[PDB]
Amino acid sequence: RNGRDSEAKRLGVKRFGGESVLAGSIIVRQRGTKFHAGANVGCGRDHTLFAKADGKVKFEVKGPKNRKFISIEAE
Amino acid sequence: GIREKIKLVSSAGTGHFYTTTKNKRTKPEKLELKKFDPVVRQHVIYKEAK
């Protein structure tokens, strides 16, 4: 009777560093803010980190508490 | 039905309601709410559940 599990929700990083992405592309589907919003990135209501402008994707590590930020470059 | 489904009829001359849920054992009073009404396209006070 013990065995049971949900359907897995397909989380994680959809687009990694070093990829030319377009606007509104979902990058990370996560639960908490394990990945933190930053430059050109919105945080969704399920903390889906979603993009705002065309360009690359750069994973910065900034902040006093050593957090993990995502950004969109231009060049 | 413990929490019961009701509506929010506009007090204007418009036949439109929104819809939401209320409880019996917490609210004896009817629900007054200001809300948009897309006939005159303004905000009208709503009442008269069900």
């Binding site: - | 489904k5 819809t19 939401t20 849920t21």
Partner: protein
């Protein structure tokens, strides 16, 4: 003996210009108040028939 028509498919579908068919979304005859206006606004228009189902619509015609 001409081909009999699947009348349900003829009621739920109609053909577009480039051979696609159109259909109407589900979840729109009853329970709607616990749903979102965003979801119902997505559901309200019509859409096209998807890829793998065209055989199972054209066979119904």
């Amino acid at each position: 003996p001409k081909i009999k028509t699947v009348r349900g498919a003829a009621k739920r579908f109609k053909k577009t210009g480039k051979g696609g068919f159109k259909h109407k979304h589900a979840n729109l005859r009853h329970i709607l108040t616990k749903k979102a206006t965003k979801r119902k606004r997505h559901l309200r228009p019509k859409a096209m028939v998807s890829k793998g189902d065209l055989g199972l619509v054209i066979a119904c015609l």
